[PDB]
Amino acid sequence: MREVISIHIGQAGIQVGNACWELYCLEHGIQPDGQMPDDAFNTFFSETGAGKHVPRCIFLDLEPTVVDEVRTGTYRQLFHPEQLISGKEDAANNFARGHYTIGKEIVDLALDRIRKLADNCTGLQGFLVFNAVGGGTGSGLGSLLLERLSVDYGKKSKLGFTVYPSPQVSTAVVEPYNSVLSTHSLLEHTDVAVMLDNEAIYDICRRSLDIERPTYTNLNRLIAQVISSLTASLRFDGALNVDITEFQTNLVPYPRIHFMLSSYAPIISAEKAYHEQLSVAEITNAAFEPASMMVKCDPRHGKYMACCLMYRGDVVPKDVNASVATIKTKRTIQFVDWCPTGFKCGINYQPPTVVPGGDLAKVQRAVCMISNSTAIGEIFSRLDHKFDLMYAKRAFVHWYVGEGMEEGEFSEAREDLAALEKDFEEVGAE
Amino acid sequence: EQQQAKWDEVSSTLAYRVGRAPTELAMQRGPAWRTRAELTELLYRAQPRDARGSNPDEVWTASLRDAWERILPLGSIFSGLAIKIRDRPGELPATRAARVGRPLDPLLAPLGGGGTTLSPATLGHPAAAAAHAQHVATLAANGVMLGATTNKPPLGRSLSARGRAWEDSEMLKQRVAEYGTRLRALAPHDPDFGA
Amino acid sequence: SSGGQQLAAKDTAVKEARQARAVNLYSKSHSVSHNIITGEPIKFPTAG
Amino acid sequence: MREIVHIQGGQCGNQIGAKFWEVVSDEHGIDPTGTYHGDSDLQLERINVYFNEATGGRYVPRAILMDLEPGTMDSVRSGPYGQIFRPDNFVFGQTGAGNNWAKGHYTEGAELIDSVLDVVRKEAESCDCLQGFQVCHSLGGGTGSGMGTLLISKIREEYPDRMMLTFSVVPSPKVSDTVVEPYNATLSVHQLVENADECMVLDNEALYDICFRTLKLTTPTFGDLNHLISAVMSGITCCLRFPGQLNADLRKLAVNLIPFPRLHFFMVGFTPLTSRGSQQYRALTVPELTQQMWDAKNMMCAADPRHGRYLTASALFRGRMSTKEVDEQMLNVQNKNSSYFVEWIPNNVKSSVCDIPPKGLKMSATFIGNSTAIQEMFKRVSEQFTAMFRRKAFLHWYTGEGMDEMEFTEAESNMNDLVSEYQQYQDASAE
Amino acid sequence: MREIVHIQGGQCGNQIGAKFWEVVSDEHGIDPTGTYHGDSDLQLERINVYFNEATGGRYVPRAILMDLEPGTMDSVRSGPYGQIFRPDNFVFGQTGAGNNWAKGHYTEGAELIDSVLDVVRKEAESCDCLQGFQVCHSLGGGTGSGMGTLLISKIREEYPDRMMLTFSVVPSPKVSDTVVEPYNATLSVHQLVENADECMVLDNEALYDICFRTLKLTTPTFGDLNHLISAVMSGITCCLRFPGQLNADLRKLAVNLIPFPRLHFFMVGFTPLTSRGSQQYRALTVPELTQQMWDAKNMMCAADPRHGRYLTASALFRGRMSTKEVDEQMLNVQNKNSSYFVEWIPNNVKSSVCDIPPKGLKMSATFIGNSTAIQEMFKRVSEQFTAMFRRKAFLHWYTGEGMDEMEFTEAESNMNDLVSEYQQYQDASAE
Numbered sequence A: 001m002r003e004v005i006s007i008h009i010g011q012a013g014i015q016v017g018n019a020c021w022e023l024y025c026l027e028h029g030i031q032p033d034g035q036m037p038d039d040a041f042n043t044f045f046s047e048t049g050a051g052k053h054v055p056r057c058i059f060l061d062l063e064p065t066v067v068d069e070v071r072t073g074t075y076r077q078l079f080h081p082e083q084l085i086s087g088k089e090d091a092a093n094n095f096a097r098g099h100y101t102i103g104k105e106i107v108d109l110a111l112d113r114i115r116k117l118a119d120n121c122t123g124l125q126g127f128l129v130f131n132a133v134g135g136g137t138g139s140g141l142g143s144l145l146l147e148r149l150s151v152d153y154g155k156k157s158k159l160g161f162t163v164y165p166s167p168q169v170s171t172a173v174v175e176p177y178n179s180v181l182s183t184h185s186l187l188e189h190t191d192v193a194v195m196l197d198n199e200a201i202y203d204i205c206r207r208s209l210d211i212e213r214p215t216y217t218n219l220n221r222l223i224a225q226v227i228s229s230l231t232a233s234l235r236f237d238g239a240l241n242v243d244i245t246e247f248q249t250n251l252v253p254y255p256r257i258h259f260m261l262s263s264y265a266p267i268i269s270a271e272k273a274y275h276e277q278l279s280v281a282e283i284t285n286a287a288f289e290p291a292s293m294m295v296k297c298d299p300r301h302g303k304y305m306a307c308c309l310m311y312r313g314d315v316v317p318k319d320v321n322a323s324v325a326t327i328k329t330k331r332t333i334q335f336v337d338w339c340p341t342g343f344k345c346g347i348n349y350q351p352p353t354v355v356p357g358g359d360l361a362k363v364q365r366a367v368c369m370i371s372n373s374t375a376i377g378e379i380f381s382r383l384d385h386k387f388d389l390m391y392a393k394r395a396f397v398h399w400y401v402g403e404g405m406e407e408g409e410f411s412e413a414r415e416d417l418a419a420l421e422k423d424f425e426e427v428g429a430e
Numbered sequence B: 001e002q003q004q005a006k007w008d009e010v011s012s013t014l015a016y017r018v019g020r021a022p023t024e025l026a027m028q029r030g031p032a033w034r035t036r037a038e039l040t041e042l043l044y045r046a047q048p049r050d051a052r053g054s055n056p057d058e059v060w061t062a063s064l065r066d067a068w069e070r071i072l073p074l075g076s077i078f079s080g081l082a083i084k085i086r087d088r089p090g091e092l093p094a095t096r097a098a099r100v101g102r103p104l105d106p107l108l109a110p111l112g113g114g115g116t117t118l119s120p121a122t123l124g125h126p127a128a129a130a131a132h133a134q135h136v137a138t139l140a141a142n143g144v145m146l147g148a149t150t151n152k153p154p155l156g157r158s159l160s161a162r163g164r165a166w167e168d169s170e171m172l173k174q175r176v177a178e179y180g181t182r183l184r185a186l187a188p189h190d191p192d193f194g195a
Numbered sequence C: 001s002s003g004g005q006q007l008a009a010k011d012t013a014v015k016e017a018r019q020a021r022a023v024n025l026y027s028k029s030h031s032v033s034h035n036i037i038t039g040e041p042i043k044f045p046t047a048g
Numbered sequence D, E: 001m002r003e004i005v006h007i008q009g010g011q012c013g014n015q016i017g018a019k020f021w022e023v024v025s026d027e028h029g030i031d032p033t034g035t036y037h038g039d040s041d042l043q044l045e046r047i048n049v050y051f052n053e054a055t056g057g058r059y060v061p062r063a064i065l066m067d068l069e070p071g072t073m074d075s076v077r078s079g080p081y082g083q084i085f086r087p088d089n090f091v092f093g094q095t096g097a098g099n100n101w102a103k104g105h106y107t108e109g110a111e112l113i114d115s116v117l118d119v120v121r122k123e124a125e126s127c128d129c130l131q132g133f134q135v136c137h138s139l140g141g142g143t144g145s146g147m148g149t150l151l152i153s154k155i156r157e158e159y160p161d162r163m164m165l166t167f168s169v170v171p172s173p174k175v176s177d178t179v180v181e182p183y184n185a186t187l188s189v190h191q192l193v194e195n196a197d198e199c200m201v202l203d204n205e206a207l208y209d210i211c212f213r214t215l216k217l218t219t220p221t222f223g224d225l226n227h228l229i230s231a232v233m234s235g236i237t238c239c240l241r242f243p244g245q246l247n248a249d250l251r252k253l254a255v256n257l258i259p260f261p262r263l264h265f266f267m268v269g270f271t272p273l274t275s276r277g278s279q280q281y282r283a284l285t286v287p288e289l290t291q292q293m294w295d296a297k298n299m300m301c302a303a304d305p306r307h308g309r310y311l312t313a314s315a316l317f318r319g320r321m322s323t324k325e326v327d328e329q330m331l332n333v334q335n336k337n338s339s340y341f342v343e344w345i346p347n348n349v350k351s352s353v354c355d356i357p358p359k360g361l362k363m364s365a366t367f368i369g370n371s372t373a374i375q376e377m378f379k380r381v382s383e384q385f386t387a388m389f390r391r392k393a394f395l396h397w398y399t400g401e402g403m404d405e406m407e408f409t410e411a412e413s414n415m416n417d418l419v420s421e422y423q424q425y426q427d428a429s430a431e
């Protein structure tokens, strides 16, 4: 009834969707077969006459391997076969390939299934698009689909949980190129874009989870827990319910500035669990710690503009107010002069469910801090030099040109990220 | 009046401090949001029923007796509370019937009040997009490669400044062309908020 | 017919589930055992 | 036979109204199924003020619940006292106002307001004589504040002479729950000033302080704060529902409190609020109730009375009490604190006495203070609104819902006019 | 002792009649074996209106079932009350009319019509006194429309003075079932205007809406629609069957409803039609019944009364009720909605009261409205008929059954004249 349509594009999108849907199935009690032994699942699942609940999700990818892993995995009887959409040729880390030549038919079929899915929803709170800025499928096809949704669906709230490349560590070479292109695209389509960095989540797993060998499964589990914390107010009741439509108005000062840091707390393994108090004040301070940011961007360089806190579990409103008042009186945390309030608290009575086989511990309290802060322009500043350093020699440019792209598009994307730099500088300024 | 004057002062100071034009500003992007909202509402209202959704209930039960209202219960009979959708297909509700443009805004004068400009040639920023594209084409024809040196940072013109705002989408043009007759039926004329 | 009996059984089950959710909501809303004003024990209203 | 139509707006308003209806149903001996089980004649004597007779012995609250999102009143229906309400009185949308006053007043509330007024008219016309309407909601929220202001405007237009009572949860000073609280509050204060006849100001942080100092709770949820607010809500009208030695209806309280039409904002408080530890140690007496009443910590509004001066102050006492005791106590209070009381009003206390106290209390007293202290609350709201407005943070949402920019200017101007009125009467000298 | 001869035509007519007889037998306490197990004297007091006594205690309906295909009344016999009907009253042919009005009226209906009239005359002569006949069938079908109209003509010739009441299921406006529905309806309306004294227009789409919006059902089969039709068919004649404080027979209803002979087409509705959830929550009073009665959503005719003007309107209430209440409610309705009522009739409501409500219900009320709104339904049927007749599609089947193309034009002209009369009395001004 408060349905949100889930879209997962590219390898990273689909692989974080794996963890997300495992988490949602565990949270609502839905077995992998499709049915469970009120109406809290309607946000993520549509129940059929036979009792089988099918998730309102769409797995879009131009490479068949990742989707076939889902088709053969434990969740083969849960997902809809036509909802899993598989391409023939991968985008090959080419934004032009994923946005101009291969992506057209796939996105047409994607909008077909998305229209069918949205028909089965009475209301529609919005879309949750999980993709990977830094690869052709994520960048190109994701940008194309976001344009499609923005134009046709229109005023539905699209939350893009994008993963940008890390400052130093990376796995692709044209990753600055396609990242700049997809940021140029999604600056104008998504309503709230959640920033993620693999380096930051790796550091989180290394220090807090004590995982010396973090992997994509752990990263995606953490991301899934963050998104479940985001959506807990849609599916479970609690004091200070926060809505998907409430997020933007409470968090977006200006149309372009909608990129948001996400930070979960606590991140503690079972062995370290139940050994500290993990009170509301302590978990709030941990959430505001610079290291807890899921993006390699120090909050101290910038100033917070808005901070939306999602509390899950046994949280009392005086405790949230006392913790946040201590945060305001803290000297390290600095807000802009023009947003004296800058805080959007929302509590929920459902503690975060734990995935068996994971490292996260069963904690009766959880906080997801999603903050709009002017600091995040630093990551765009990094990519703005990573891009132009290669573009000066026009390396790998012919690959993008071959699939229907032009020098003007590269130049315009660089211009637009420079514009975003100036926008962050200006929101930081008095 | 005093707050208007301070808006000019604040915007001038910010533009001086940063370097971008006062029009290409975070604060002065409210009208763009309003135009986008109006466009989305009009595009949602102007759709054939298949595009609006092939829902058997929405298509038949609402349409019967031209009631156009559906009962959505919120649980069992014991809840007994439900939503009347009360949706009339092909008509804007009176609340959203109004189109709004700022006619006194000094900065919005070049566009002419914004609004809906529902004709495809009028969507977005046609003049700015044409000028930017022509300049790019002239540079390409003269062989003037851009981004020669990394120490030269980009100018930083906005999406609307370069003519790639959300209202400038090629999909927006295509879909308004598709839905044009019904879009005319809903909104016969573009208000011309400037005058 | 058996249909009416099954419908009545479903209605009773719905009532029981609603009572369970109501108990959960009351327990979560109230923080201390006694009443905050007019100090007195408080229970679920019930009386049905 | 002077009926009151209750209306609840937004999540905060709906929760507070549900707790209030639980309290009033208890006070009138109504079980959650609606049957009367009070075993007391006075409880049924004036049950028609809040309730209507159903087909059986059931009694239905004359309450109308509004929202733009279904979750809050799904929880309300599934709550302990959710089954009393007629489902036809639940007027809700599908897409909630995203804490956007513009969304709750112009775009999304405008379609729902037709059904809202239809239900309001249906409930009001059935009333024999209508004392008025009471609307519970929160400033600083989209659906709550927006629909509350819109409905208050509509009801003011339809029923000009009928009483308008509002219980608005004003945003707290230190901690702001939502970011756009100053915008929503400034927009809603503008409407309440113009339309609402009588308005109570509430602050969550003041409630936390009172419940952690006086009541000394360890983990006070919104359930306990809503219980306090509901206690005040009952105590304000108990003279209508029960016989009183010196009774006072809502209009009598309004006449005795409001000196000038726009200075109708009040800070309210309830006594005696006692911690469970010192319940046996305290002496439940009229002087004790008065001293606890006039304490600055007892006020549920953030503003403290000491900074301002009391224009007027009403106190509705409940219980078998000595009117001489009450009058002497209040005269002694005014004499001792003459600095805190306005000079040009010879008597600053409106004492009411009801013969029926709430269950468990042999005596009780609710306090309603019109003082110039609320000036500082409005001043803080203005200081936040100016800071956010100056740069237009989050203003594009209100612009995109079809609101002129000068609507904010007009709201802020009216609020500053109210502030300067309070200052002028605070420093106004006799002759 | 004023007998009514029930006749069913076509599969739709037969199923509606089966549901109606089930409902009537339940009201009179007759088990499907025909024996009386009702345990109430008023039930047997006037059972002879619809039933005849067999050798034992068995009661046989005065019903006559008509068809050209045997499967439909095979299903009727297989239905729960299939064995009460006398087997000799089943008149049915070999080849069903393929939705062909010409086949059901001229070629195949001619042979069966002799047997049909024989059974009708045999049932009518057994009657002590005959109020008349009630014929339930569906326009837009071959055997139903054709045989019904032909039998109606024959019975009108035989017994001109006796009442003829028709329950015709006019093809639905939006969603049509068969292609030739406009042809059959156009041919049948021309016959009904000339022959039928009193006619009720029913629409499956209107029944679906009443059961979707009032009854709030999920998957309403034809059985539910037939159940509502049967409830109204009972409620119209319950005055003949039960004692009433102010009784009114079919002839009285026709006299008070029909101002001019050709304007005898009515829209009908039943109250209280209630959802399961709000059964406890609804206040079951005469004003509530009237409010639900005059709602357009309660009409079983697709045409909404708001567009037209109520020429006349009868309200047959059932239950121990206040005649002052009923009369005041009717006068208040007329005064409030005077725009929707014709001016040159001082009182447009014929109120009747029966003392015995339907089983399970404390109260009920059936409404019969003669209003000019049905003009738009006939207009729409003409808008389909003219479009198809311009290109003469599917006309060859009718032409091959031996009916002139002149008959189509004459029927269309008659229907257009009826539309013109309805508009004329819609816009007629007094003096």
Ligand SMILES: Nc1nc2c(ncn2[C@@H]2O[C@H](COP(=O)(O)OP(=O)(O)OP(=O)(O)O)[C@@H](O)[C@H]2O)c(=O)[nH]1
Binding pocket: A009, A010, A011, A012, A013, A015, A016, A061, A063, A090, A091, A092, A093, A094, A098, A132, A133, A134, A135, A136, A137, A138, A139, A163, A171, A172, A175, A198, A216, A217, A219, A220
């Ligand atoms: N956090 C996280 N990131 C991932 C994961 N898998 C891939 N990524 C990131 O996603 C980026 C590329 O994503 P995709 O575009 O989907 O890769 P693809 O599916 O082969 O599609 P193309 O690269 O366009 O051909 C890589 O640079 C990785 O950094 C994952 O499991 N977790």
Ligand SMILES: Nc1nc2c(ncn2[C@@H]2O[C@H](COP(=O)(O)OP(=O)(O)O)[C@@H](O)[C@H]2O)c(=O)[nH]1
Binding pocket: A239, A240, D010, D011, D012, D013, D015, D016, D097, D098, D099, D138, D139, D140, D141, D142, D143, D144, D145, D169, D171, D177, D178, D204, D222, D223, D225, D226
């Ligand atoms: N006393 C009390 N206050 C509440 C409750 N829920 C929310 N609030 C307060 O109400 C304020 C506004 O929320 P609200 O208007 O309901 O949001 P909306 O429903 O979207 O309009 C917030 O600042 C909360 O602090 C509650 O249950 N009790």
Ligand SMILES: Nc1nc2c(ncn2[C@@H]2O[C@H](COP(=O)(O)OP(=O)(O)O)[C@@H](O)[C@H]2O)c(=O)[nH]1
Binding pocket: E009, E010, E011, E012, E013, E015, E016, E096, E097, E099, E138, E139, E140, E141, E142, E143, E144, E145, E169, E176, E177, E178, E204, E222, E223, E225, E226
């Ligand atoms: N209300 C109702 N309508 C029916 C039922 N069965 C059929 N109809 C409708 O009646 C219309 C006419 O069909 P009908 O006259 O029975 O066919 P015929 O008997 O062969 O002439 C069809 O379009 C059906 O939609 C029923 O049981 N109830």
